Paper text:
Here, we show that a core component of the fork protection complex in the eukaryotic replisome, Timeless, harbours in its C‐terminal region a previously unappreciated DNA‐binding domain that exhibits specific binding to G‐quadruplex (G4) DNA structures. The FPC comprises four main proteins—Timeless, Tipin, Claspin and AND‐1—that are conserved from yeast to mammals. Inspection of the amino acid sequence of human Timeless revealed the presence of a conserved domain in its C‐terminal half (residues 816–954), with a predicted fold similarity to the myb‐like proteins of the homeodomain‐like superfamily, that bind double‐stranded DNA (dsDNA) with a tandem repeat of 3‐helix bundles (named here N‐term and C‐term). Our findings indicate that Timeless contributes to the ability of the replisome to sense replication‐hindering G4 formation and ensures the prompt resolution of these structures by DDX11 to maintain processive DNA synthesis.
We used X‐ray diffraction and NMR spectroscopy to investigate experimentally the structure and dynamics of the newly discovered Timeless domain. The 1.15 Å crystal structure of amino acids 885–947 (C‐term), corresponding to a single myb‐like fold, confirmed the presence of a three‐helix bundle characteristic of the homeodomain superfamily of DNA‐binding proteins, extended by the presence of a fourth C‐terminal alpha helix unique to the Timeless domain. The N‐ and C‐terminal domains adopted the same three‐dimensional fold; in particular, the N‐terminal repeat shared the presence of an additional fourth helix, H4, as seen in the C‐terminal repeat. A distinguishing feature of the Timeless DBD is the presence of a fourth alpha helix in both N‐ and C‐terminal 3‐helix bundle repeats. Superposition of the DBD C‐term onto the structurally homologous domains of the telomeric protein TRF1 (Court et al, 2005) and bacterial cell cycle regulator GcrA (Wu et al, 2018) in complex with their dsDNA substrates shows that, if the DBD were to adopt a similar mode of dsDNA binding, the fourth helix of both its N‐term and C‐term repeats would likely lead to a steric clash with the phosphate backbone of the DNA. Although it is conceivable that the DBD might rearrange its conformation upon DNA binding, the fourth helix of both repeats participates in core hydrophobic interactions, mediated by conserved residues L872 and F879 (N‐terminal repeat), and L936, V937 and L943 (C‐terminal repeat), making such rearrangements unlikely. We found that it bound with low micromolar affinity to both ss‐ and dsDNA probes. Indeed, when we tested a well‐characterised G4 sequence present in the promoter of the MYC gene (Ambrus et al, 2005), the DBD bound to it with nanomolar affinity, and about one order of magnitude tighter than ds‐ or ssDNA. While Timeless DBD binds to both ss‐ and dsDNA, it binds with ~ 10‐fold greater affinity to a defined G4 DNA sequence.
Numbering used by the authors: 885 to 946
The structure:
């Protein structure tokens, strides 16, 4: 794996998150669509660090 994000990798993460956030497996759809190898837990932490979600439970809303 890698653990840092280039500017373009961050923008890609955001586009995929925006698309898949209402699915039942947002992280799975993100991971299927990025080329870099990354762990699920690190991607979750990056979504939090960017403020795309404010806390973990927002990744799976009712």
């Amino acid at each position: 794996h890698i653990v840092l994000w280039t500017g373009d990798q961050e923008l890609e993460l955001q586009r995929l998150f925006e698309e898949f956030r209402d699915s039942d497996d947002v992280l799975g759809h993100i991971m299927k669509n990025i080329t870099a190898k990354r762990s699920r837990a690190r991607i979750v932490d990056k979504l939090l660090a960017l403020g795309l979600v404010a806390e973990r439970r927002e990744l799976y809303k009712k």
